[PDB]
């Protein structure tokens, strides 16, 4: 798969098709979906890292919506990107 | 009444891959 | 209306690498899926939209990079830009 070869969990092939959906006449280089998949994997890792810390701090073994809120509402950049 | 329109944790089941 | 894609399985794989012992609830996973769908559509939007306003035939990493710094605040952008270039540096090599 192309996603392993970029070191990613997110699917590069899916991001390729998403990029092609925006303009079916616009072509997609190979770097574009790899770069975008890594950006979203990083952002996903960042939210889950902080939300997982909130779960552990509250003696919980799973993330619930309140933990996502605690993580994002206390991070200025995530709260201002995600709302 | 939190059980009428609030978040109830025991009704939010675990996400399951398989 | 429009159909969102499901990224739950990939969000879950990322959770296991950063918190192996920690699960996630269905409602929490749905919120993550909407975050991922929202950021994918926003970045992919400006990359397609920069390539059509800058007379470019092809969407490359440099429209993604520009869009990432247009939309992501502060250090999130720099780190995201760090992670993006390293991914194509394993991919091209």
Q: Where exactly are the structural domains of chain A?
A: 1-83
Q: How far apart are CA A82 and CA A68, in angstroms?
A: 11
- Indicate which of C74, C84, C89, C93 best probes the interface with A, i.e. most A CBs within 10 Å of its own CB: C84
- Contacting partners of chain C (3+ CB pairs under 8 A): A, B
Architecture of domain A1-83 in this structure = Orthogonal Bundle (1.10)
CA distances from C59 to A21, A55, C31, C44 (A): 12, 39, 29, 10
Are B9 and A62 an interchain contact pair (Cβ–Cβ within 8 Å)?
A: no
Documented resolution in Å: 2.4
Experiment used for this model: X-ray
In angstroms, the separation between the Cα of residue A49 and the nearest Cα of chain B is 17
Closest CA to A44 of C85, C42, C34, C68: C34
Number of domains chain C contains: 1
**Count of all residues that appear for chain C in the document:** 93
Residue C64 belongs to a domain with what CATH number?
Answer: 1.10.20.10
In this structure, how many other beta carbons lie within 10 angstroms of the beta carbon of residue A7? 15
């Amino acid at each position: 798969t192309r996603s392993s070869r970029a070191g990613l969990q997110f699917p590069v092939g899916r991001v390729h098709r998403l990029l092609r959906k925006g303009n079916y006449s616009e072509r997609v280089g190979a770097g574009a979906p790899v770069y975008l998949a890594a950006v979203l994997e990083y952002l996903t890792a960042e939210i889950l890292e902080l939300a997982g810390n909130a779960a552990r701090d509250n003696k919980k073994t799973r993330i619930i919506p309140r933990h996502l809120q605690l993580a994002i509402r206390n991070d200025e950049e995530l709260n201002k990107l995600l709302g | 009444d939190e059980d009428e329109d609030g978040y109830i944790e025991e009704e939010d089941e675990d996400f399951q891959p398989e | 209306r429009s159909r969102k894609e499901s990224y739950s399985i990939y969000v879950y794989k990322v959770l296991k690498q950063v918190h192996p012992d920690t699960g996630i609830s269905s409602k929490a996973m749905g919120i993550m899926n909407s975050f991922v769908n929202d950021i994918f559509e926003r970045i992919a939007g400006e990359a397609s939209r920069l390539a059509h306003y800058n007379k470019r035939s092809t969407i490359t990493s440099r429209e993604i990079q520009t869009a990432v710094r247009l939309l992501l605040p502060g250090e999130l952008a720099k780190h995201a830009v760090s992670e993006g270039t390293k991914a194509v540096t394993k991919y091209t090599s």
